[PDB]
Amino acid sequence: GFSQIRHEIPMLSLDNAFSDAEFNAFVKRIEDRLILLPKPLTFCCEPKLDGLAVSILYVNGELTQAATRGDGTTGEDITANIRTIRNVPLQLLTDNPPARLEVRGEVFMPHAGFERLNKYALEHNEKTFANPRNAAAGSLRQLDPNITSKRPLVLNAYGIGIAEGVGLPTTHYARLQWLKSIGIPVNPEIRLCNGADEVLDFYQDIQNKRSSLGYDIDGTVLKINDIALQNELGFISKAPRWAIAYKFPAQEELT
Amino acid sequence: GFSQIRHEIPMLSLDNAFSDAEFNAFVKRIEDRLILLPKPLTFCCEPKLDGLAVSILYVNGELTQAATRGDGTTGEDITANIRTIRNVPLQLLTDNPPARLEVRGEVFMPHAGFERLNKYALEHNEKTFANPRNAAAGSLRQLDPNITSKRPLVLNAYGIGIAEGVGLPTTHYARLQWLKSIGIPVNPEIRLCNGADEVLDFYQDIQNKRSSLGYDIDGTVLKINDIALQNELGFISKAPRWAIAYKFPAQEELT
Ligand SMILES: CC(C)(CNC(=O)c1ccc(Oc2ccccc2)cc1)c1ccc2c(N)nc(N)nc2n1
Ligand SMILES: CC(C)(CNC(=O)c1ccc(Oc2ccccc2)cc1)c1ccc2c(N)nc(N)nc2n1
Question: What positions does UniProt annotate as the active site of this protein (chains A, B)?
């Protein structure tokens, strides 16, 4: 199979909200927690794309390795597969590439590609992919990078992991803009919002085009723009490093 | 339904190991991480019981509230249900109860009870419980605490959450012994181990009696005994507090 890769920096998951009610609930939880509410709190609002999350490493501007999210802590080495994705640059353009930079984002299959692939499948006696999401995951997680080569995949960056030879801007949005400039792809629907009301609008606007843009949008990820606040706000951890459950082999049936 | 309760302190999950290989892997990961290996590292080795995890709160010795684990961050108020569990004390015996103490452990159904309950079910035209685990969960999560009253449940403590009017000992094992003395039930199979080899023995010994003791044992949870090291070792977190995914309502079918 694929070589396993332990992410130097974790690939955390997200809590979900399925209503404005739960969303404000989330906001309030933050306000209280924050030492002093800046008023009115700015969120970097970006669309959540339907696909597979991946981590790409750049060493002095050169794409050197990539992996799948895995369990969030260990993924699979899909470097070669990643190089086949056109919109993924092999070289960051800056003249001053950080020592090491880890770009994170969604790999996905737009409607046109998805539709074409499935047309081919059906007409050639092969189960079609249920959705662009699943199609993406399979197209990408290929032992033979040539197959991945022929699948229409696209990368939309949303974050950074390791980062050394740099002093990243203080705001997430500023960071995404930097990633753009150095040649990395990031969704253009990302906007800045002040206060729930404003965010909720973003939510509505995006939802009213979750499929109209040419690709699938799962929902919207809302993040506090100010990096300092992020550090302050913390991480809703779970599972200790000092312990572990060593489970017994499954119970067998009678007979 | 049940009133929701947000755990003041989280109810973390555990990583698993299904082989000595993965176990040592876990140990090594710790040794490296630790600033200085004390040699040879002591683990509090306790059996992992098959059932439901619960959190019981004592205010000045009095059981005042209890809840289910939920998603680890929010559970259900099952206080009344808990009071029906015999081996759960309503009053900690010490003359000096902490301001507030939160005891955590597994609620479960031993073989005898499980078997009896199911005998009744079958003979009265009712689906039997597949296992003591499931039977426990259902017997406990009852809107009517009287039903829970008639199900044979048992509590085996394994940890502490909130703790105020106290200065808990420096070792987990010391802490469990304290919980015993103040009247709380804890599994007697808990032993102390030095170095993998020793732990691995515990693993074998317990596995060779995972059902022979009169109740079901899932596996064995291994923890570093020294609380200081625990703090040092940290928490393998996942999910930020500064962000959240606001998902769109599910996709609908054609027609
Ligand atoms: C926000 C984050 C959860 C990424 N963030 C991280 O993975 C992450 C990881 C370690 C961090 O810091 C730590 C460093 C060391 C230890 C622990 C935490 C901080 C953020 C996320 C996840 C999924 C997303 C998605 N599908 N679409 C969009 N648009 N954005 C998304 N954003
Ligand atoms: C070790 C722990 C994961 C409990 N520990 C915690 O829930 C926990 C929670 C917050 C902690 O500290 C924090 C406080 C605030 C924020 C974050 C962490 C530390 C431990 C656990 C889980 C399941 C067990 C089981 N089925 N059987 C046995 N025998 N032991 C078990 N032990």
Answer: 48 (n6-amp-lysine intermediate)
Q: Which domains does chain B have, with CATH numbers?
A: 4-235 (3.30.470.30)
Q: Is A124 on the interface with B (CB under 8 A)?
A: no
Check if A158 has its Cβ closer than 6 Å to any atom of ligand 1. yes
For A254, other C-beta atoms within 10 Å of its C-beta total: 3
Distance B252 CA to ligand 1 centre (A): 29
Q: What is the number of other CB atoms lying within 10 angstroms of the CB of residue B165? A: 13
Q: Which two tokens stand for residue B144?
A: 């009517």
Task: Provide the token pair at B187.
Answer: 């599994």
Alpha carbon distance A136, A115 (integer Å): 12
Mutate to test the pocket of ligand 2, among B6, B8, B9, B156 (most ligand atoms within 8 A of CB): B9
Question: Which member of B229, B238, B245 has the closest CB to residue A10?
Answer: B238
Residue B12 Cα to ligand 2 midpoint, Å, equals 5
Distance of alpha carbon B87 from alpha carbon B75, whole angstroms: 22
Cα A251 versus chain centre, distance: 38
**Resolution for this experimental structure (Å):** 3.0
Closest by alpha carbon to B222, among B246, B247, B198? B198
